[PDB]
Design a protein around this ligand. Structure first.
Ligand code: ATP
Ligand code: MG
Lengths: 50, 48
């Protein structure tokens, strides 16, 4: 289908695991819809994509 | 690849009255505050 679900996803890069880049991301991507992800630099958007 | 806040912050303080600046922009974005404007198309300069 293509239905993605982030449920309380948190991430810290392995080289610097003490810092959390993402904290408690919860959202859903449904087919037929567009979900824009906006914010300043260093917020963690490319980390979400990765 | 800069957020809007930093784009506005780094708008025109680059010049100090004794520095030549050439700001290359894809569009006329945050460049209307420039003394001179040069439009280039297919390698040809277009007069204002
Ligand atoms: N490979 C890496 N190892 C460690 N930290 C990293 C790595 N890549 C990115 N970071 C850090 O993770 C944080 C988030 O980076 P990310 O690229 O996800 O942010 P972003 O909001 O997408 O950035 P931008 O808006 O500039 O594209 C930044 O503090 C960055 O320095
Ligand atoms: Mg990025």
């Amino acid at each position: 289908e293509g239905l993605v679900q982030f449920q309380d996803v948190s991430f810290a890069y392995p080289n610097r695991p003490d810092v959390l880049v993402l904290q408690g991301l919860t959202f859903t991507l449904r087919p037929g819809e567009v979900t824009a992800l906006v914010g300043p630099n260093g917020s963690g958007k490319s980390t979400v994509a990765a | 690849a800069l957020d809007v806040q930093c784009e506005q912050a780094l708008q025109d303080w680059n010049s100090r009255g004794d520095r030549t600046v050439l700001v290359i922009a894809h569009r006329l974005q945050t460049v209307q505050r420039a003394h001179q404007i040069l439009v280039l198309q297919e390698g040809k300069l277009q007069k204002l």
